[PDB]
Ligand binder design. Structure first.
Ligand code: NDP
Ligand code: 2W4
Ligand code: CAC
Length: 610
């Protein structure tokens, strides 16, 4: 049986502080290191404590143990955390193509080769070129086995000098200089910038002076350890723009920077109009093949806008590199809504970063990011309650119905606009009824408030509504050039409107609701060419679930990859799509058990082709 990649999808601020605070081991090791340093002036077997104690016994000691030091948990803490992935994925999302050329500076003591390829490897489409470099060839000798496994190329580069020609036009430069010394930082960073293509990223990991870890190390080692202000001043000096910042509770820091690109005048298009008239406008804008002006889609008046999933899909289409977006999405009504009109200081900052995804949520700018699901028992259902599957006669719908029945559901309402149309559907319904399950086939349409209200009423007769499942879908596939507002309306009706209506009706009339679940897609989460409308519709459903959960209502969006055995896509299982395999229904149903038992608002499941 195949093993899916299971992730949570979370709003992630660009700037995060106090990272790794939950980790007891690091908090415990820091306290110890602080005590040892205090002793010199006046877990325990980790490299930094062992080194300090040796100092307590007393350069010869320090020099000997230096290669071992970067792998100390405190020194490597941010690196073995979701902060690293967040930064990398931001870079990836802002690449003009599926290729990313990566060069590691001072790899000998940096050790990013043992993390970055492996973190990006589960990406099904990404073409990674990774070169580990250092000043001396001897520096990378002990890592050869690791480098070989990950297909990491090698290079000679002392950052005090300009980069060799081979390493230039890089998309991403990475450096862990927590232990490794850059030498003169200004000169080092200057050469690093030159090695980047315009729009390329720099990812620096380091220790901050004026914070415990950095101060502890600086003491031990008496160029050098720098303050945060010093680093940020250096970035400005070499024309780098800081677009990401992750700081641990002990003062280790990931700086994500970007080399700017000369910017043509941006085109602003509001995508809030309910009639989808902006579609026609956007088609005209993209139709200009010659134009290199970036296209900035603005969602400002609707927190449930699907612009994010829209953008993901349009980025995969011709002229997609031009696309950017801004989304204002407060979960709290009390939160301030910033002004992002063209004159504004808030908008200027965003334009300077030039990031594809700019989402404002409750006081912070950031973007939605994927993270490996930590959680990695079978659920059961209240047998007296009624359960509703919109699109319940479909491929996934019939399997979900079976699944629910297995878990005790006796009362089901399956909605479909045109009712039973296949022999398979007819047989399953009859069989379930024979088994004693109350199964109602409804034509009530959640696309309208009236239809949503009638549907709940129909379910309420069988029993109180315990669960709603939105599997309704209508597809209007095609590149944006061949799209229309009407087609956008058709695709959004079962999903955006359906979920808005279900949200409202269940709020008003379903106080015993335990489950509110929508089936999203990787088309929204990752992007699929020719499905921008579908990307939008799904994205909007996710936004709604998030708002609900903030208010303490049930809400869950599942981003499914290709589904096997049954469904639109199969209508097969061995058919590779975008480096992924269709997930066998049996695998899907096991994942659902896990997902229903989950605190997170938006989840993701897909299967990688080996
Ligand atoms: N199949 C796949 O590979 C994947 C599926 N998706 C998601 O999974 C879910 C189920 O997909 P799948 O089973 O493959 O699709 P199917 O086409 O097999 O079934 C979906 C059903 O939705 C019904 N429907 C459409 N609009 C409405 C409406 N307004 N009210 C009631 N019913 C409606 C349709 O029937 P009728 O026309 O009679 O109304 C249709 O039978 C969807 O939400 C989809 O986005 C996610 C990832 C990949
Ligand atoms: O929703 C539907 C059906 C109901 C309409 N789907 C069918 C397959 C998929 C959309 C699609 N069609 N063709 C095609 O190649 N895809 C696809 C696009 C992207 C990714 C994918 C997955 C994980 C990833 O992680 C990082 C990047 C990335 C990309 C997988 C598949 C959904
Ligand atoms: C769907 As049950 C109620 O778990």
């Amino acid at each position: 049986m195949q093993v899916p990649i299971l992730e949570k999808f979370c709003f992630t601020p660009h700037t995060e502080e106090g990272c790794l605070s939950e980790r007891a081991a690091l908090q415990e090791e820091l306290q110890l290191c602080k005590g040892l340093v205090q002793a010199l002036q006046t877990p325990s077997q980790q490299e930094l404590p062992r080194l300090l104690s040796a100092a307590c016994r007393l350069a010869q000691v320090l020099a000997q143990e230096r290669p071992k030091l970067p792998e100390d948990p405190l020194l490597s803490g941010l690196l073995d955390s979701p902060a690293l992935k967040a930064c990398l994925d931001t870079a990836v999302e802002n690449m003009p193509s599926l290729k990313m050329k990566v060069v590691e500076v001072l790899a000998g003591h940096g050790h990013l080769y043992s993390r970055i390829p492996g973190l990006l490897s589960p990406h099904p489409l990404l073409q990674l070129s990774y070169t580990a470099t250092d000043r001396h060839p001897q520096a990378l000798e002990a890592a050869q086995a690791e480098l070989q496994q990950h297909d990491v190329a090698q290079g000679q580069w002392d950052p005090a000098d300009p980069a060799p020609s081979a390493l230039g036009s890089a998309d991403l430069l990475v450096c862990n200089c927590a232990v490794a010394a850059l030498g003169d930082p200004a000169s080092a960073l200057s050469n690093m910038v030159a090695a980047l293509r315009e729009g390329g990223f720099l990812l620096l990991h380091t220790l901050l002076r004026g914070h415990p870890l950095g101060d502890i190390v600086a003491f031990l080692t008496s160029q050098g350890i720098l303050s945060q202000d010093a680093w940020e001043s250096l970035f400005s000096r070499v024309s780098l723009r800081l677009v990401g910042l992750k700081k641990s509770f002990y003062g280790s820091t990931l700086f994500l920077c970007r080399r700017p690109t000369p910017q043509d005048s941006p085109i602003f298009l509001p995508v809030d109009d309910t009639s989808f008239r902006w579609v026609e406008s956007l088609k005209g804008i993209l139709a200009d093949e010659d134009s290199a002006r970036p296209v900035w889609l603005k969602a400002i008046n609707c927190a449930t806008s699907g612009v994010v999933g829209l953008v993901n899909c349009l980025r995969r289409e011709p002229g997609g590199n031009r696309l950017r977006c801004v989304l204002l999405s407060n979960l709290s009504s009390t939160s301030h809504v910033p002004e992002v009109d063209p004159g504004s200081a808030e908008l200027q900052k965003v334009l300077q970063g030039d990031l594809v995804m700019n989402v404002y949520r409750d006081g912070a700018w950031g973007a939605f990011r994927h993270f490996l699901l930590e959680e990695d028992s079978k659920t059961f259902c209240p047998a007296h309650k009624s359960y509703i599957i919109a699109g319940g006669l479909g491929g996934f719908g019939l399997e979900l119905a079976q699944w629910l029945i297995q878990r005790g559901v006796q009362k089901l309402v399956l909605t479909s606009r045109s009712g039973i149309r296949t022999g398979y559907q007819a047989k399953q319904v009859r069989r379930w009824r024979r088994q004693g399950v109350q199964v109602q086939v409804s034509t009530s349409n959640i696309s309208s408030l009236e239809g949503a209200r009638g549907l709940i009423a129909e379910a309420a007769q069988l029993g109180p509504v315990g669960g709603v499942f939105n599997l309704a879908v209508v597809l209007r596939d095609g590149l944006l050039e061949n799209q229309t507002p009407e087609f956008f309306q058709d695709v959004c009706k079962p999903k955006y409107s359906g979920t808005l209506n279900l949200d409202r009706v269940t709020r008003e009339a379903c106080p015993e609701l335990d489950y509110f679940v929508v089936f999203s897609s990787v088309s929204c989460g990752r992007g699929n060419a020719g499905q921008s409308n579908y990307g939008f519709a799904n994205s909007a459903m996710e936004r709604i679930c998030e708002k609900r959960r903030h208010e303490g209502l049930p809400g869950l969006a599942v981003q499914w990859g290709a589904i096997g055995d049954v469904g639109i896509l199969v209508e097969t299982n061995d058919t590779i799509v975008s480096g992924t395999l269709p997930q066998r229904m049996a695998s899907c149903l096991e994942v659902l058990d896990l997902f229903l038992n989950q605190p997170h608002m938006v989840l993701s499941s897909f299967v990688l082709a080996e």
